[PDB]
Amino acid sequence: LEYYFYFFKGMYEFRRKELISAISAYRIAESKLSEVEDEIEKAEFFFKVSYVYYYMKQTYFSMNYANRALKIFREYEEYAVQTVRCQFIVAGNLIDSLEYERALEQFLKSLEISKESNIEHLIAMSHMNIGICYDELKEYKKASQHLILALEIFEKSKHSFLTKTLFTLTYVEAKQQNYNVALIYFRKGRFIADKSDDKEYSAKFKILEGLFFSDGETQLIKNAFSYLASRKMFADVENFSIEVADYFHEQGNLMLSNEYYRMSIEARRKIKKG
Ligand SMILES: [Cl-]
């Protein structure tokens, strides 16, 4: 009963996003976990802990607590959902460490389990995340095939991940210079983003637009970064500005390319500063 209180309190503080309090409460719940019964109430506990750690990008701690929950959840065949989610945490942490090959292995396992258990949304989530790793690994053909499979499911369900999947799909096709097919996913995603009031992807589509689908309207890229930066989305600013910087480097536009490397530096500094 005592562990339960500290446990619930941790989830409670995480809800109001008091991260220090949550982990603080979890730290004692874990001590009073000495008197724990079922292997899966522990697993439930470890999962939550890995999650708050994943939120604070404490990559080492998150992946530790995730694996401990995972190694238990795998057995109990009634807990496929929990198993898949644990694997997402592991793979998300691996993504944060730029271990995209290892993260792909995780997500591939997730897809198998999501399949043999017919969890439709987890199937699309695996496909999407697989496609994202592939994009990072620059295997764009496979990235696209996994992304449309995700798209088929999300379009039916109208889940929020629809926008992000269309965005990633658009970008992947643009990187292969498949500008005509990309423009189709661009208009479709840009529309879904606008009508869902997804201001974040609206700004992100504007970056693709300035990059690929206007006549070189670079101010669109700029204004979109202004929007993102104003929203304190510095990870997005850091990652996207590097992609933009790389692209201009490949074109031989060194001045523009430098401007965006500089911006990524600043965004990184803002992340360390909190
Ligand atoms: Cl094309």
Side-chain angles (χ1 to χ4, degrees), residues 108-162:
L108 285 170
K109 286 199 294 165
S110 300
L111 181 57
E112 296 178 53
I113 291 170
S114 300
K115 277 185 182 182
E116 230 232 344
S117 187
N118 278 286
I119 315 298
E120 190 87 322
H121 193 244
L122 289 188
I123 285 176
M125 283 189 70
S126 300
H127 280 316
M128 184 190 68
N129 284 313
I130 286 168
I132 290 181
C133 297
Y134 272 141
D135 171 42
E136 292 293 328
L137 291 170
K138 313 196 177 312
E139 214 316 87
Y140 301 135
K141 277 184 157 186
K142 283 191 269 195
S144 284
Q145 182 58 51
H146 281 277
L147 286 162
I148 62 152
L149 286 183
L151 194 60
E152 294 173 24
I153 291 159
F154 286 153
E155 213 131 36
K156 295 177 171 181
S157 175
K158 308 165 188 180
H159 188 265
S160 61
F161 281 143
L162 180 48

Side-chain angles (χ1 to χ4, degrees), residues 163 191-202 227:
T163 303
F191 164 66
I192 294 193
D194 258 279
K195 90 171 189 149
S196 63
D197 192 34
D198 205 321
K199 344 126 95 183
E200 164 201 357
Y201 275 93
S202 175
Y227 174 83

Side-chain angles (χ1 to χ4, degrees), residues 51-73:
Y51 195 77
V52 45
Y53 275 136
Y54 178 61
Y55 197 97
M56 320 182 65
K57 299 288 149 182
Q58 274 290 322
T59 306
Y60 192 91
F61 276 58
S62 170
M63 194 148 33
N64 188 282
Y65 281 95
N67 282 315
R68 289 193 53 97
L70 174 52
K71 256 190 54 183
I72 298 174
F73 273 133

Side-chain angles (χ1 to χ4, degrees), residues 63 66-67 70-71 74 82-95 99-114 122 125-127 129-130 133-134 137:
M63 194 148 33
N67 282 315
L70 174 52
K71 256 190 54 183
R74 298 216 307 262
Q82 290 81 12
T83 288
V84 169
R85 293 180 181 166
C86 284
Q87 297 173 331
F88 282 8
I89 305 292
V90 170
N93 281 301
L94 291 168
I95 285 182
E99 290 287 347
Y100 289 100
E101 218 148 315
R102 292 177 183 265
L104 176 70
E105 295 159 24
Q106 283 305 311
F107 287 129
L108 285 170
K109 286 199 294 165
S110 300
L111 181 57
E112 296 178 53
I113 291 170
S114 300
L122 289 188
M125 283 189 70
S126 300
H127 280 316
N129 284 313
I130 286 168
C133 297
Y134 272 141
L137 291 170

